[PDB]
């Protein structure tokens, strides 16, 4: 092994001490940097929510004017009910986004402001704890220099007192009364001084070993426990907890707006399911009762006191009435066969139209995954054209059948099948 | 009963005919009015969605610039992960509202445009059917006038031929050969004429009864069936069905935007639940390994070839080392009792701080139902103040205990409890 003196031992120690001081400074720089990052995030969070509140108010105002626009230019009928509920949903959504903006401004932003301010306080105090820790550790490292130096001085004195003693022992067996006595008292004085010096050296070595033990314990405690604890117990005090609550306030606000919106959309879905042409027609006909009310039946009006009120089927008129009845009947048979054919065409075409207009083409889910028209329209048009043609035809046929049947039935009543 | 002539019967009939014509016109006015209402609703629906698309694009653009603002001013740590996901949610919501605007412009509005155009066609045709119906009905009512008039004329001829016959019968029993023959041929000519005229009258009455029957059947069919059918089969063709699909496209778009938003908010909720101070600390210490890495232990450095490396507890130094050991031990006992008391105060105060910062104050549900701060803050501050005081105290106590213990333990090793 090396034979080392004070200058070298001290310098080699000083090297590691300066390394530790350098590492302590860096630890402080890392901590400062992490604090500046937290302060910056909290500032970003404030600016993010301030701007979003503004965006939300704008949206809200625009939705309000959208609803007002149509609520100013003004019911029982199912499509108007859908419309009413559609406008109500806009009013509801407008209010909800104002509420959102208020929550951002009055609840969420102040939490970030408060946490920023608290973090300012907290980090100043945590850094003070940190500096106390580093100051005590440096104090301990700096105490070791003199402890070692004392051990080095006293050890050297012990070595050189041993030199002067051992030569005075070699000079003892040289002269071995006048001179023999004189070098005896000499080697005696050396023996005393060595003994004293060996003792001083032992005690200083013991001091050094004791101090070393305290030094390693201090270094270990700082690096293995105190740094970690400083972060957990000081720097991180309240941070994650506060951020959790602030962000859960955001989530609560959103969840509630979504629940309110869902409610609104469900009311529109109910209205849409209540779309009902025949019920709307009932409502219309009842509203305008007097428009649709049937007139009193026309009655036979006796002229100049006429006693008779029924068909007269006596001779000679009976034969011609029988002729007529038969005439009406066969003609009605032709017309009815023809009319049924037109009816069946009209009904089949109506079905086709129903197929066209009830096509389930409303699912727009594909539009939310991010990772020819004129020919069907012309076909529907031509189908509807043919439909109205057959409808007009059907109705004219029916109108003639109604008149002829009515006359036939009155004759049948009077005449019977056998007369 | 009244004895009525042609003028009165015709006028009373004409009155009810003019009533029916008047009611037919009103039916047409009601139908026109209902069509203008449908056309107007569909126009409102177009204008509503055109404006909402605009509102939605605006909102979308604003959200995009909100995200870009922060995505430009730029990780592993749990709070930064929450922030990242928060900005991602804005990007997602921006896109979803553009999609919404596209669906309004490219899908929903064209449906209302198309339905308006189709309704224009449909109503023109339905009105034609209506006019055919009303024209035929009016035709039938107008046919009855001549039928009645003929019955009135022939009935009158029958009455007055009966007059001239009956007097010629009274003049028969007057003269009852020259004159007797002359009035016989007279009453004969009357008998022929009456018989002829009674027959004409019967036939005209029969015609009238037949025509009446056809007239009442036509009126009934129109009022009880045709009007209702005209509405169902013509006016209402495709309307409710088309509106259903258009409005369900709206609902689908909304449902999908809500599902996408829900997904986004769930990802933020996951991040918030992953807020973890100790894990973030592990990550930090590992990132900056060389900042936090402990130095090599200080070793005993032998001076000028020193052979000894351990405590020397021989006499005379043993007694003083024993004295010292005991000295360290009793002092360590005092310090530890004191240090534990400070530790317990510090820990109880930490608990209080944890209670403060983890308060569940984030539910904002009450804000969506539409039908003192500085004192708790000063308390938290003073609690934190006291906490740092006790922390500094605790750590200084601990730092002394660490050094004294380390020296005590080395002595205990060398000396034992009995020496």
PDB file of C-alpha atoms in Angstrom, chain B residues 162-255:
ATOM      1  CA  UNK B 162    -157.364  16.694 -63.556  1.00  0.00           C
ATOM      2  CA  UNK B 163    -159.212  20.019 -63.131  1.00  0.00           C
ATOM      3  CA  UNK B 164    -160.410  20.146 -66.761  1.00  0.00           C
ATOM      4  CA  UNK B 165    -161.370  16.440 -66.614  1.00  0.00           C
ATOM      5  CA  UNK B 166    -163.351  16.737 -63.360  1.00  0.00           C
ATOM      6  CA  UNK B 167    -165.430  19.722 -64.476  1.00  0.00           C
ATOM      7  CA  UNK B 168    -166.123  17.921 -67.792  1.00  0.00           C
ATOM      8  CA  UNK B 169    -167.405  15.097 -65.559  1.00  0.00           C
ATOM      9  CA  UNK B 170    -169.653  17.589 -63.696  1.00  0.00           C
ATOM     10  CA  UNK B 171    -170.890  18.916 -67.064  1.00  0.00           C
ATOM     11  CA  UNK B 172    -171.539  15.304 -68.167  1.00  0.00           C
ATOM     12  CA  UNK B 173    -174.237  14.855 -65.485  1.00  0.00           C
ATOM     13  CA  UNK B 174    -175.485  18.329 -66.489  1.00  0.00           C
ATOM     14  CA  UNK B 175    -176.681  17.411 -70.043  1.00  0.00           C
ATOM     15  CA  UNK B 176    -177.591  13.991 -68.622  1.00  0.00           C
ATOM     16  CA  UNK B 177    -178.051  13.307 -78.282  1.00  0.00           C
ATOM     17  CA  UNK B 178    -176.444  16.175 -80.277  1.00  0.00           C
ATOM     18  CA  UNK B 179    -174.883  17.983 -77.276  1.00  0.00           C
ATOM     19  CA  UNK B 180    -174.632  14.800 -75.094  1.00  0.00           C
ATOM     20  CA  UNK B 181    -172.307  13.284 -77.734  1.00  0.00           C
ATOM     21  CA  UNK B 182    -170.281  16.541 -78.010  1.00  0.00           C
ATOM     22  CA  UNK B 183    -169.410  16.700 -74.268  1.00  0.00           C
ATOM     23  CA  UNK B 184    -168.766  12.939 -74.137  1.00  0.00           C
ATOM     24  CA  UNK B 185    -165.958  13.283 -76.741  1.00  0.00           C
ATOM     25  CA  UNK B 186    -164.763  16.264 -74.668  1.00  0.00           C
ATOM     26  CA  UNK B 187    -164.493  14.385 -71.307  1.00  0.00           C
ATOM     27  CA  UNK B 188    -162.931  11.560 -73.325  1.00  0.00           C
ATOM     28  CA  UNK B 189    -160.164  13.877 -74.620  1.00  0.00           C
ATOM     29  CA  UNK B 190    -159.616  15.056 -71.029  1.00  0.00           C
ATOM     30  CA  UNK B 191    -159.416  11.465 -69.741  1.00  0.00           C
ATOM     31  CA  UNK B 192    -156.720  10.711 -72.346  1.00  0.00           C
ATOM     32  CA  UNK B 193    -154.788  13.886 -71.502  1.00  0.00           C
ATOM     33  CA  UNK B 194    -154.973  13.433 -67.700  1.00  0.00           C
ATOM     34  CA  UNK B 195    -153.896   9.739 -68.031  1.00  0.00           C
ATOM     35  CA  UNK B 196    -150.958  10.824 -70.227  1.00  0.00           C
ATOM     36  CA  UNK B 197    -150.079  13.631 -67.814  1.00  0.00           C
ATOM     37  CA  UNK B 198    -150.392  11.575 -64.641  1.00  0.00           C
ATOM     38  CA  UNK B 199    -147.954   9.131 -66.282  1.00  0.00           C
ATOM     39  CA  UNK B 200    -145.455  11.886 -67.241  1.00  0.00           C
ATOM     40  CA  UNK B 201    -145.607  13.154 -63.624  1.00  0.00           C
ATOM     41  CA  UNK B 202    -145.033   9.684 -62.071  1.00  0.00           C
ATOM     42  CA  UNK B 203    -141.982   9.128 -64.337  1.00  0.00           C
ATOM     43  CA  UNK B 204    -140.523  12.569 -63.467  1.00  0.00           C
ATOM     44  CA  UNK B 205    -141.117  11.916 -59.724  1.00  0.00           C
ATOM     45  CA  UNK B 206    -139.308   8.569 -60.120  1.00  0.00           C
ATOM     46  CA  UNK B 207    -136.422  10.332 -61.893  1.00  0.00           C
ATOM     47  CA  UNK B 208    -136.305  12.867 -59.058  1.00  0.00           C
ATOM     48  CA  UNK B 209    -136.217  10.169 -56.342  1.00  0.00           C
ATOM     49  CA  UNK B 210    -133.472   8.340 -58.243  1.00  0.00           C
ATOM     50  CA  UNK B 211    -131.458  11.522 -58.656  1.00  0.00           C
ATOM     51  CA  UNK B 212    -131.939  12.414 -54.967  1.00  0.00           C
ATOM     52  CA  UNK B 213    -130.510   9.070 -53.978  1.00  0.00           C
ATOM     53  CA  UNK B 214    -127.406   9.629 -56.160  1.00  0.00           C
ATOM     54  CA  UNK B 215    -127.071  13.156 -54.781  1.00  0.00           C
ATOM     55  CA  UNK B 216    -127.130  12.137 -51.093  1.00  0.00           C
ATOM     56  CA  UNK B 217    -124.688   9.258 -51.809  1.00  0.00           C
ATOM     57  CA  UNK B 218    -122.258  11.704 -53.487  1.00  0.00           C
ATOM     58  CA  UNK B 219    -122.491  14.272 -50.659  1.00  0.00           C
ATOM     59  CA  UNK B 220    -122.008  11.507 -48.026  1.00  0.00           C
ATOM     60  CA  UNK B 221    -119.043   9.933 -49.830  1.00  0.00           C
ATOM     61  CA  UNK B 222    -117.323  13.313 -50.105  1.00  0.00           C
ATOM     62  CA  UNK B 223    -117.851  14.429 -46.507  1.00  0.00           C
ATOM     63  CA  UNK B 224    -117.419  11.108 -44.684  1.00  0.00           C
ATOM     64  CA  UNK B 225    -114.717   9.435 -46.825  1.00  0.00           C
ATOM     65  CA  UNK B 226    -113.112  11.482 -49.570  1.00  0.00           C
ATOM     66  CA  UNK B 227    -111.946  14.496 -47.513  1.00  0.00           C
ATOM     67  CA  UNK B 228    -110.300  12.290 -44.906  1.00  0.00           C
ATOM     68  CA  UNK B 229    -108.751  10.118 -47.645  1.00  0.00           C
ATOM     69  CA  UNK B 230    -107.554  13.137 -49.575  1.00  0.00           C
ATOM     70  CA  UNK B 231    -105.598  14.261 -46.478  1.00  0.00           C
ATOM     71  CA  UNK B 232    -104.214  10.793 -45.623  1.00  0.00           C
ATOM     72  CA  UNK B 233    -103.356   9.574 -49.129  1.00  0.00           C
ATOM     73  CA  UNK B 234    -102.426  12.841 -50.857  1.00  0.00           C
ATOM     74  CA  UNK B 235    -101.537  15.772 -48.607  1.00  0.00           C
ATOM     75  CA  UNK B 236     -99.665  13.699 -46.005  1.00  0.00           C
ATOM     76  CA  UNK B 237     -97.711  11.597 -48.509  1.00  0.00           C
ATOM     77  CA  UNK B 238     -94.164  11.106 -47.246  1.00  0.00           C
ATOM     78  CA  UNK B 239     -94.210  14.133 -44.899  1.00  0.00           C
ATOM     79  CA  UNK B 240     -94.003  12.586 -41.367  1.00  0.00           C
ATOM     80  CA  UNK B 241     -91.686   9.829 -42.674  1.00  0.00           C
ATOM     81  CA  UNK B 242     -89.249  12.332 -44.220  1.00  0.00           C
ATOM     82  CA  UNK B 243     -89.286  14.574 -41.153  1.00  0.00           C
ATOM     83  CA  UNK B 244     -88.716  11.507 -38.941  1.00  0.00           C
ATOM     84  CA  UNK B 245     -85.554  10.578 -40.847  1.00  0.00           C
ATOM     85  CA  UNK B 246     -84.280  14.168 -40.993  1.00  0.00           C
ATOM     86  CA  UNK B 247     -84.765  14.596 -37.264  1.00  0.00           C
ATOM     87  CA  UNK B 248     -83.289  11.144 -36.454  1.00  0.00           C
ATOM     88  CA  UNK B 249     -80.188  12.176 -38.428  1.00  0.00           C
ATOM     89  CA  UNK B 250     -79.947  15.107 -36.029  1.00  0.00           C
ATOM     90  CA  UNK B 251     -80.339  12.727 -33.052  1.00  0.00           C
ATOM     91  CA  UNK B 252     -77.735  10.274 -34.409  1.00  0.00           C
ATOM     92  CA  UNK B 253     -75.202  13.112 -34.930  1.00  0.00           C
ATOM     93  CA  UNK B 254     -75.756  14.289 -31.309  1.00  0.00           C
ATOM     94  CA  UNK B 255     -75.628  10.782 -29.796  1.00  0.00           C
TER      95      UNK B 255
END
